[PDB]
Every structure is written in structure tokens, then in C-alpha cells.
Design a protein around this ligand. Structure first.
Ligand SMILES: [Cl-]
Ligand SMILES: [Cl-]
Ligand SMILES: [Cl-]
Ligand SMILES: [Cl-]
Ligand SMILES: [Cl-]
Ligand SMILES: [Cl-]
Ligand SMILES: [Cl-]
Ligand SMILES: [Cl-]
Ligand SMILES: [Cl-]
Ligand SMILES: [Cl-]
Ligand SMILES: [Cl-]
Ligand SMILES: [Cl-]
Lengths: 574, 574
């Protein structure tokens, strides 16, 4: 009977090493084999409500004649084995895909879908070379784990992401275990204490000493904290260089305030030439898909459009798993939520064709320190040679507010920045009030001429939309850790007092700055706990006591011979 | 096989009038009949993800050997017939329960669960007298539709609730229809415009002229707007008086910032003596169960505890549907999230035994207008005869901020009240800074001595926790519409200038005001759009143009002969 199905729980699937993973099978009432969709999940396959509201109404797929397989990852919940993040997922996915393809009920066409960790596992599956995998749909995902979510393109540790995720998975690992232990109860309390106060947890020095988290999940230290360079340990689990040779259709979803955004978008660019790639980007953070934030509301249309997403996924899988050649007729290649106008808009490509990468130069009379300083932004090079100077003290970093926070206050992406504007280490540069709209849609970066009293330090840049009422709404930001200015792989220190031209990767945005608004850039040397704090020593940052760290007098140079600027992806639509 | 199940979609169930309602059957793999749980849903039975995250991981029930039936209400989605809210649900539930009881797979024991509208339908089902209904679990529900969600104990229309819900259901009614209409597209846009701006929609006068909503759902005007008195049209759909004679176990869930809270709690009190009743109350609003708000965070333990709720529901149904006499061993009768200390706590009853209903009298030197006025609260009667006076202008009502808002900004219950504190029509009375904690847990009310220049007007009272940093966090509030001061059924007007002693029902809270905090009360004559604005004319409010309305000079009397006070349910736990 069409629309009817059955569910088989805890079907045990043998991996190559004999370890069995648990799956649930959602199989339609049908008279032959059917196309199959796989979801690989470290948060209990049973608990479908927890993640699905962030993805698709995927029971519609089953009602429409797809089978759906949901799997517990190795060493979690009903699965056998031992859990270590990322390292087993390529092989386990290959073996899982092979098993599905052998079953009576599978017609030889398999796809995947799902969000975050359920998205990363899809790239790991796609590089396996299993011919029966016809399409993937990675949402809020990354193909380079160093670049997201653990470190970043600037070479700073995403400390809140690491500690929050570890505490979340830690809670799962305890719940999953062979038999309850006497220390379980106290461990839960401590994990809850971390999740209630991630910035506090991230503030303890040395950072690398994590009694609880290091015991529950040794990987947190052995892999992540201990490998600050993008070295061979990271390349091993990286998929990105392999993406260019793939020919697998991918339905890619991202959020402007999502921790994975830079890497999600990069995956689209990497696969678009060789296969049918699609892109959907909304104004969401990892834990807030509602479109509603404390000081910024995007409208009901901004709410994660789960039924539209479900329709689009089904059309996509119909095209690639069911060979229906017209299934994606009328479906755009790219669909973006353009903030400011606060509207969804169809595009033919990402980056947008007809992006004008435009420098906006830092300038102004007198110090740009604080929002009441003299800092300006202009499409013209600054006429006079100036410098803004501040003290960066690791004991007092600039607090993270909005942006791409995951676990520490990760539900307020477009955060009002006014609470940090009277700080002396926050340099502010803004345009005049705009008489006419300026659209900024694409990847964003800064080029700054900088110097320091230290042999290492950080520089941050943050793009901000200043509203008529004074709200200064965060759009996108990045960091450069100076030892990694040239390379993430082979860092070198800087000479105190010497001027360097450095790039800051500020990820991406889509915003129309409307008449009455200003374009604003904040520059500093910290953004904590989004990124860990640079010790200003040149040492092994995660191994240093706070008292071992140094302050740094940092300087931004601006003028004709040091034309520091932000590069904005300008779109003009008449 | 234990843990396995099947799903049959769109099974058509005949009602007494021959109209067929659509259900989905989730039936376990079993060798005999099983106990059955029913959910009655106006938001598409297919769309399980939309409501379930607010309820239970109910697939665990199916894996544990319960069948689950989810039904589309009459006239919506896959069901036949015509949709009108509330009026058909008693009969349709009786016929649905009868059909389930007749099926091969039902063992004669049926229960219900679910949230909001899926909770109200459970009281309607329980009064039907179907013996096979052994237990219900109404979450965020009401047994008196006048008192919640449409009007209230004070006799004011909950206008934002009415317009928001109508627009939501309107969107469903269009999606559900026989065949797409040319005007559907424009109707969707207009419904979206209402949902993006509920206060704007509520501001149009006369209120009763609703071209779009009145066309899509005539009931919005014919029943709700046209019947401001708690008259025979309301008693018809009211279940409350019938609750006292029931003997049906009920697992009742509520939220301190939920629109249905006063009525949810009343249902517990009404049934507790004759059957096994349970109560669970968290710090949630109808659309925000996260425990996180713009200016107030309750901790991760405050997040709606879906797996604990699932375990408790299953134990409850095991006890009452499966006759397992020890199933609820160790389960508390009452479990409350006590705000301030921000901890869950078990209790033996609601109201708490050992509640001291304590008057806190309004006082102070000079005007209590604004937060910088002289208004005080004290357990001692005020020594001097004073009065605070303000102008209430319907064209400029006090805006709603937090509280029990449903659709207009309904995701910020514990809202900071500072944005309205410099208003002259907001009278503020506060205690000294507390040296020691004061717990307020129970139902809350005010008794005010009031006078007006008008023949009708409103008075509002709002309890507030003032934090050390200045945040003035809303706790609970109510309203009295003066024509309904004595009765909701047979209103009479007041004489201008005459003093009346009036009661204001402020629903309920659980809060410890900690050392360093103040207890604060705000008094006014509007709270819009939580409640519609009184026109100050004595007229038919919903039929008046703004220009037809009058201003009112309103007065709060306080002193020895007019001891205006708030009654706080004080708990002392040494
Ligand atoms: Cl089988
Ligand atoms: Cl161990
Ligand atoms: Cl806004
Ligand atoms: Cl739109
Ligand atoms: Cl100098
Ligand atoms: Cl130079
Ligand atoms: Cl059957
Ligand atoms: Cl009609
Ligand atoms: Cl707080
Ligand atoms: Cl607790
Ligand atoms: Cl007078
Ligand atoms: Cl009197």
C-alpha cells in the first residue's frame, strides 16, 4: 500500500573488522527494491526529533517510496566498538553503504542527508568511491575539519566549539555505556557545568589540562588541542583535496551565522564544475534556525523552511536516485536569504557572477579606538599616514558576541555590538550614513598592515551593519594568528616592531546595508571564547599559564603606503 | 519482534454523521491486542516533527508496545468535513475513541497525550464518558476556553492570541483545500504580514472588522470577538464544571510563561481529589521551551526535558493502561522549576501545603509614577492616605513585554521591563533590596482600591524581580476590565469618581527573590496586544473606532482605609 511503511529497530551491521553498528530501517510497502537514504548519527538514531527539525520532514521520503536507514556511529548508543571522532567514519560509511547495496530491498541507488556531524559523515562517505552512492545532501557541514569546526583559516583554536561539543558527546558516552558507574552522576553534573558556562571552562589555564573531558574523550587533547598546526594529523581526516575529483551531486545547506559556513560554501565551489551542486543559505546559527534573535528579527520567511527543504531534497533525490530527468525543473542552482531586505533570492552561481571585489580603506582623523573615535571607511585610499594603537591583554580579551559561535551563546548570531564599543582595544571604522543601499553578498576578507611589540599575536576583523536606532549588528568576522600569517602548516614568528601585510579570512555574508545605515568594521586582537586567546609569547599557547602570558602593544597602520582595507563583495542590481 | 512496528497512513474513520477523519496508525509488532494512545491534531498528522519536540519522544511508546494513533481534526488536511474550532471535538473524540476500542489491535485501554490544541482536545475527550479512556496527559492546555486562551479571568480579549492563531490556522486551511484558488497566493502573503506584525494587526479599529481572517475563519468574529461576556455561547464549549465529577488520571504539564498556565493549573486542582493527577511546570513560553531568553537564562536543566518527560509519561501509562501498580514508584506528585535558584524541585501538592498568602501593601512618599517614583511594597499597612494618578490613553497603551504572550513576541517570557519604566502611566512599587531570600510559589493576585473618570476602564498588575544589575524581569501579570469586576457573565458599568475594591487574577509563579534583588509590582491600565485596549466608553469595545474612544484619568488609592496590596504565596523552607 502506497504511503505505508514498517520500522525495524537495531538491525546489526558488520563492519570489516567484525564490529557491528546498529541501524533502524524505515522501509516502504513496495513490491520490489527501492532507492535508499542513509543518515549516520552520533546522537542516538532512536532520537529522531532532536535533529530532524533542523533538516527535513524525511518521513515524507518514506511515504513516497524511499527506504531510510539511520545508524548509531561506532561506540555510541546501540552500536558496538569504541568511539573516536572522525577517524573511523570513512571506512564505516563504505562498509555500511556496501551492506545496504546488498540488501533485497535496495535497488542500487543510495543517497544521504542530514545536518552538522550528520553532514560531515556524508563527505567522508562520498570519497569512498562506492558507485551506488548517487547523491548527498550535507547541511551545515565541512570537508576540512581543521578549517571547521576545530580551528579555522586563521590558525586559532575554536575553543568554545571544542569544549561544548566534547561536553555534549561526553554526556552521550556516559548514557551509552556498558553498565552504570558510581562516578557517572558526578560526571553529568560537571558536564552540565561546562555547558552552562563555556567561556568559564575555556578560561582555565593551561587550556590543555582537561581532567574530565580528557578522561571521557582523550581525542579532545591528543588530536585537537595538541595539534595547533594544520599538520599531517589533520590532512589524514581532511577530504577537501579529494572533492575536486568527485562527480557526486550535492545539495549543500549553510547558515550565515553557522560555525561551518566558510567550509560549507567552499564545498559547493569545489564540486560545482563536475556534478549537479545546489546551494541554500539562510540567516541561521547552529542552534537557532528560527530567524528570531535578541536584537534582530528576519521575518517568518527566514524560519528554517522545513517543508520547502523537504520538497527540494525529494526533487533532488528523484532526479539523481530515480533518474527522473525533469525532477529539478524550476529549482534554482543557488538560493540565498539576503539580509537587510530580508528576502530569499534565487541566483545562478556562488560566488555570484558580477561580484565586484571592492576595497574599503581604513582612515580618519585621530585615533579610531572605540565607536566614538574618528575611524572611517571609504572607497578612496586614505591621504595621510596614520596608525591606531592599543594594548591587548590576554587576561582581558574582547568577549565574543554573536557571529558563528556554536555552544557559548550560539543562539544570537546577529548580536548588537554596542556592549563592547567603549573598549580601547576595539578599533572602529565606519562609512557615512548611506543615502542609497549597498549590497554585500559573497566571501569577505581584510588586508591589514600591522605591527606588534610581541613575537606573536592575533588580529581580528568584524563586519557590522549600524542601524538608524544605534544597534550595531554583527555580520561576519575572522582572525589571523600571526605565526600562521603565511601558512597554517609551517608557522614562523614575527619581529617586534616590523610592519606586516596580513590577510584575514572573514568567511561570507549576504546583506543589503539600507539607506540610513552605516557599513562598519571592528578591528582588535581577540574574540574569546569563539577563538582561544593568543598568549603573545610565541609559545605553545594551550600549554601556557595565564601568568606566563604577556600583554602586547598592537598597531594598525593606515595611509597611502599602508592601504589597510576590507574587501567587500559588492553586488549592484538595478 | 519487540521494538519493531508498522505505520498505516490515511486510515479513514467514520464519525456519527458519516464524515470520515484521517488517522495514521503506529502499531507495534505483537501477538495480541495492545494499549493505545491517541493524539488529535489540527496541524497535519503527517508533520510529527512540528509539535513532538514540545511533548515526548513518543516513538519510544511504540517501541515499548503501545499503538499510537494520530488524527487530522475535522475539515483539515486529509480529513473530510468543515473546520470550526472546539465545537465538534467532544463528539469526534467520542466517535474516534469508540472506533479505536473496536479494533482488533486495541486491548481496551486507551490514553491521550500532546500539547496546546492537542491538550485541550483531551479534556473534551475525557468528559465523553468512554470507559476505555484510562488516562490523559494534557500539556499547556485549558478546560475553559474563555479563561484561556481567548479572553481571561479579568474579562479582556487576548487579542494577539486570537489573531496569531487565526492566521496560523488560516495558513493550514488554505494548504488543506479541495483545489488551489487564484486568491490563495495573495492570502498567504497577508497571513504572513499578520504573523510578522501581530501588534499592528491588533491595532486596526474597529477590531471586529477582519476582512481576511473573518473570511477564512468566520468563527474568529462570530464566536470570539462578538462574545466578550462569558455567556452561554462560551459555557457550551467549557469543560471545567464537568472536571470535578471525573475520575480520570491526568498528567498535566504547564509553563510559567505559557498563555494557558492559569487554566492548566486549575485543571490539576479540579481533578486531584478523585484520580491520580500529576503536575510538571517549567519556566517556558508557548513557543520557547529552551530555557534561554534575551535577558534571562535558566540553565541547561531548564530546557524542556524531553527524555525525562517521555520516561514519566510511559510510567504513567504503564500504571493506568497496563495495570502495573508499582510503575509510578518514586515519581513525585508535583515537580516545579523554581526560578531564581533555577532548580527543579519535587512537591506533594499544588497549591503547596504551607503556602502563606501574604499581603504586600502599596505605599510611599510622593507619586509612584515611573520606576524613579517613591512607590514602596511592605508587609505593613501604609500609614498615610495617598493616591497615584495617571492618564490612560487608548491611542498609547503600555506595550506588552514578555509574560504569557503567545504569538506577538512570545519567545521572551522573562522580559526586562526597563524599556517602559519612564512612562507616567506605569506605577512602580518595590521592596527594599533583600538581605535574605523570599520564595513566592503559588497563585498570585492583587486587591486594589481604584477610581476612574470613565464609566469603564482596565487595571493591570505585574510582578517583577529586580536584579542587582538593574534588569527588571517579568514574572506574572493579570488584568481586570472594570465592567467585569464582579462577574464575567453579567457586566455593569462604574460611576466616575467612585472608589472600588477590585481583584486582579495574576495567574501563578515560582520564584525565589534572592539577596540583592527587589520584589516589584507595576500597576497600569493597559498591556497591549496581550490584552485588547479598553476604550474607556462603556461601549462594545471591539466595534469602536480609535477616534470614538476616550482617555481616562485613573487613580490607585493607598493607605489605612484603602489598603491596596498584592497577595504573595510565600514559602519558607529552612
Ligand atoms: Cl526482513
Ligand atoms: Cl574507560
Ligand atoms: Cl529587526
Ligand atoms: Cl522571502
Ligand atoms: Cl612609536
Ligand atoms: Cl613599511
Ligand atoms: Cl490491518
Ligand atoms: Cl469557502
Ligand atoms: Cl540570567
Ligand atoms: Cl535542577
Ligand atoms: Cl482630585
Ligand atoms: Cl471610600
Amino acid at each position: 500500500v502506497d504511503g505505508n511503511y514498517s520500522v525495524a529497530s537495531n538491525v546489526m551491521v558488520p563492519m570489516r573488522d567484525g564490529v557491528r553498528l546498529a541501524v533502524d530501517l524505515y522501509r516502504p510497502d513496495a513490491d520490489g527494491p527501492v532507492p535508499v537514504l542513509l543518515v549516520r548519527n552520533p546522537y542516538d538514531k532512536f532520537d529522531v526529533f532532536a535533529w530532524s527539525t533542523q533538516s527535513t520532514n524525511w518521513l515524507e521520503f518514506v511515504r513516497d517510496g524511499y527506504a531510510v536507514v539511520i545508524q548509531d556511529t561506532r561506540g555510541l548508543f546501540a552500536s558496538e566498538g569504541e568511539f573516536v571522532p572522525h577517524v573511523d567514519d570513512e571506512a564505516d560509511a563504505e562498509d555500511t553503504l556496501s551492506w545496504i547495496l546488498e540488501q533485497a530491498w535496495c535497488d542500487g541507488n543510495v543517497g544521504m542527508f542530514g545536518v552538522s556531524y550528520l553532514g560531515v559523515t556524508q563527505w567522508q562517505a562520498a570519497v569512498s568511491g562506492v558507485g551506488g552512492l548517487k547523491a548527498i545532501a550535507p547541511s551545515m557541514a565541512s570537508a576540512d575539519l581543521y578549517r571547521a569546526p576545530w580551528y579555522g583559516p586563521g590558525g586559532a583554536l575554536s575553543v568554545e566549539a571544542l569544549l561544548g561539543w566534547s561536553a555534549l558527546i561526553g554526556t552521550g558516552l556516559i548514557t551509552s555505556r556498558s553498565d552504570a558507574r558510581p562516578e557517572d552522576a558526578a560526571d553529568f553534573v560537571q558536564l552540565a557545568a561546562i555547558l552552562n558556562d563555556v567561556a568559564g571552562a575555556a578560561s582555565v589555564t593551561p587550556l590543555a589540562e582537561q581532567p574530565l573531558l580528557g578522561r571521557l574523550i582523550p581525542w579532545v587533547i591528543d588530536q585537537v588541542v595538541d595539534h595547533p598546526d594544520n599538520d599531517e594529523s589533520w590532512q589524514s581526516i581532511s577530504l577537501f583535496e579529494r572533492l575536486g575529483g568527485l562527480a557526486t551531486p550535492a545539495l549543500i545547506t549553510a547558515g550565515w551565522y553557522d560555525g561551518f559556513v566558510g567550509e560549507s560554501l567552499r564545498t559547493f565551489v569545489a564540486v560545482k564544475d563536475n556534478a549537479d551542486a545546489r546551494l541554500v543559505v539562510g540567516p541561521w546559527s547552529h542552534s537557532n534556525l528560527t530567524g528570531r534573535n535578541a536584537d534582530r528579527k528576519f521575518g517568518i520567511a527566514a524560519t528554517y523552511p522545513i517543508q520547502e527543504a523537504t520538497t527540494m531534497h525529494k526533487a533532488f533525490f528523484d532526479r539523481h536516485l530515480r533518474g527522473e530527468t525533469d525532477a529539478l525543473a524550476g529549482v534554482p542552482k543557488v538560493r540565498l536569504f539576503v539580509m537587510g531586505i530580508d528576502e530569499w533570492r534565487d541566483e545562478t552561481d556562488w560566488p555570484l557572477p558580477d561580484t565586484a571585489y571592492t576595497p574599503f580603506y581604513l582612515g580618519g582623523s585621530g585615533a579610531a579606538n572605540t565607536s566614538t573615535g574618528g575611524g572611517t571607511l571609504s572607497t578612496s585610499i586614505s591621504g595621510t599616514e596614520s596608525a591606531d594603537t592599543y594594548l591587548y591583554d590576554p587576561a582581558d580579551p574582547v568577549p565574543s558576541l554573536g557571529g558563528t559561535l556554536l555552544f557559548h551563546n550560539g543562539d544570537n548570531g546577529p548580536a548588537d555590538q554596542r556592549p563592547i564599543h567603549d573598549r580601547d582595544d576595539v578599533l572602529c571604522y565606519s562609512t557615512e550614513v548611506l543615502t542609497d543601499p549597498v549590497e554585500v553578498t559573497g566571501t569577505v576578507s581584510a588586508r591589514l598592515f600591522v605591527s606588534s611589540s610581541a613575537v606573536d599575536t592575533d588580529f581580528t576583523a568584524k563586519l557590522v551593519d549600524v542601524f538608524p536606532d544605534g544597534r550595531a549588528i554583527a555580520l561576519c568576522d575572522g582572525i589571523v594568528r600571526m605565526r600562521y600569517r603565511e601558512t597554517l602548516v609551517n608557522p614562523t614568528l614575527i619581529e617586534a616592531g616590523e610592519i606586516y601585510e596580513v590577510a584575514i579570512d572573514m568567511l561570507a555574508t549576504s546583506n543589503v546595508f539600507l539607506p540610513g545605515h552605516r557599513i562598519m568594521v571592528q578591528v582588535s586582537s581577540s574574540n574569546f571564547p569563539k577563538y582561544d586567546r593568543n598568549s603573545n609569547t610565541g609559545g605553545v599557547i594551550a600549554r601556557e599559564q595565564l601568568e606566563e602570558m604577556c600583554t602586547a602593544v598592537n598597531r594598525i597602520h593606515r595611509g597611502p603606503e599602508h592601504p589597510s582595507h576590507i574587501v567587500l563583495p559588492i553586488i549592484k542590481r538595478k
